[PDB]
Amino acid sequence: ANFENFIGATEGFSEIAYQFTSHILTLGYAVMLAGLLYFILTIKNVDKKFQMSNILSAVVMVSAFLLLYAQAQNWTSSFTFNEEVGRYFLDPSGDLFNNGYRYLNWLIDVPMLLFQILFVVSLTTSKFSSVRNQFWFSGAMMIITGYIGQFYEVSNLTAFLVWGAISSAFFFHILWVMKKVINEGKEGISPAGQKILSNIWILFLISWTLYPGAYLMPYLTGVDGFLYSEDGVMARQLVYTIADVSSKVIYGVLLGNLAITLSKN
């Protein structure tokens, strides 16, 4: 299956790496529940015309709470302690760790997080339907090809890499279109909102880049190095959780602040 199930079957997990990974992944879904309440409760502070952005954030929160909770359980319930070795090992009598929950979550969120900025910023010379359709197409393909390449994570490394680069192509298309969007979005609005739009752009850039970083993390120290272990698994799930909080929660808080700033007129 995956690099996680490999380590779980071929070397096992120190209680620290196991309990750490369960804790960070719990942090993950708990934060999505906190954000859900935040977006619902704040929806009154923004004019009707921006509220659709809050709505989309609330929906993203629901789909990340539900799927990142499924994955938390999947990770905990997939390994059992061995008293002889004192380490956690993949259980043959379980579901086995399965990261489809995460890709299913990305496939849902991606249209919604890309669509929502289009409800707070106005374009200048670009058409709303062109940006939208371009976001949705390459957002879906980025994920689908990323899911395919992930089927070869442990087995064929070279396929894992060439698919990753395919999925990166679509990612770079999205970063291109988002940059145009942020440029046209800057025209006209106050300097304060231009400041927030620039913050949104940097956070969008880093936070989305963390995801390919966590996809390559075990092989980053070579095909036999330090991260090729329970420590790369630890780091991979830590980066993911950081990327989840930033691109899903923090992103929508920033768009909310912008919308309020745009109601000063």
Residues that bind ligand LFA (CB under 6 A): 30-31, 34-35, 37-38, 41, 59, 62-63, 66-67, 70, 98, 100-101, 103-104, 107-108, 111-112, 115, 143-144, 147, 168, 199, 206-207, 209, 212-213, 216, 220, 235, 238-239, 242, 245-246, 249-250, 253-254, 257
Q: In angstroms, give the least distance from the CB of 187 to ligand LFA.
A: 21
Q: Does 4 bind ligand RET (CB under 6 A)?
A: no
Q: Per CB under 6 A, does 67 bind ligand RET? A: no
Q: What does 38 bind: ligand LFA, ligand RET, none (CB cut-off 5 to 8 Å by kind)?
A: ligand LFA
Interface positions, 106-135, toward ligand RET (CB under 6 A) = 106, 109-110, 113
Of residues 240, 246, 238, the one with CA closest to residue 101: 240
Q: Residue 208 interacts with ligand RET (CB under 6 A)? A: yes
| Contacted entry of ligand LFA, ligand RET, none for residue 80, CB cut-off 5 to 8 Å set by kind | none
Of the pair 14, 100, the CB lying nearest ligand LFA is at 100
- To ligand RET, the closest distance from the beta carbon of 163 in angstroms equals 8
Q: Which of 233, 248, 254, 261 binds ligand RET (CB under 6 A)?
A: 248
Nearer to ligand RET, 123 or 144 (CB): 144
Position 254 contacts ligand RET (CB under 6 A): no
